[PDB]
Amino acid sequence: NWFDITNWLWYIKLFIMIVGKKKKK
């Protein structure tokens, strides 16, 4: 069931936030 999707939806979203720091542009 697609109930607690945010449980992983945040984890996968937290990754980008990291790489997003790589370099400056």
PDB file of C-alpha atoms in Angstrom:
ATOM      1  CA  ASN A   1       0.000   0.000   0.000  1.00  0.00           C
ATOM      2  CA  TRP A   2       1.184   3.511  -0.857  1.00  0.00           C
ATOM      3  CA  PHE A   3       0.598   4.841   2.658  1.00  0.00           C
ATOM      4  CA  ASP A   4       3.999   5.682   4.140  1.00  0.00           C
ATOM      5  CA  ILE A   5       5.673   6.755   0.898  1.00  0.00           C
ATOM      6  CA  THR A   6       7.369   9.771   2.478  1.00  0.00           C
ATOM      7  CA  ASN A   7       9.418   7.278   4.490  1.00  0.00           C
ATOM      8  CA  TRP A   8      11.616   6.790   1.423  1.00  0.00           C
ATOM      9  CA  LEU A   9      10.468   9.802  -0.595  1.00  0.00           C
ATOM     10  CA  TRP A  10      12.549  11.966   1.739  1.00  0.00           C
ATOM     11  CA  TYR A  11      15.623   9.729   1.647  1.00  0.00           C
ATOM     12  CA  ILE A  12      15.831   9.822  -2.149  1.00  0.00           C
ATOM     13  CA  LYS A  13      15.207  13.572  -2.019  1.00  0.00           C
ATOM     14  CA  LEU A  14      17.903  14.107   0.611  1.00  0.00           C
ATOM     15  CA  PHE A  15      20.502  12.633  -1.742  1.00  0.00           C
ATOM     16  CA  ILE A  16      20.142  15.302  -4.427  1.00  0.00           C
ATOM     17  CA  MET A  17      20.472  17.995  -1.762  1.00  0.00           C
ATOM     18  CA  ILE A  18      23.953  16.605  -1.119  1.00  0.00           C
ATOM     19  CA  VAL A  19      25.327  16.375  -4.657  1.00  0.00           C
ATOM     20  CA  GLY A  20      23.711  19.755  -5.237  1.00  0.00           C
ATOM     21  CA  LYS A  21      26.540  21.215  -3.168  1.00  0.00           C
ATOM     22  CA  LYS A  22      29.195  19.783  -5.485  1.00  0.00           C
ATOM     23  CA  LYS A  23      30.913  22.614  -7.356  1.00  0.00           C
ATOM     24  CA  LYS A  24      29.436  26.108  -7.640  1.00  0.00           C
ATOM     25  CA  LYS A  25      27.333  26.972 -10.689  1.00  0.00           C
TER      26      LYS A  25
END
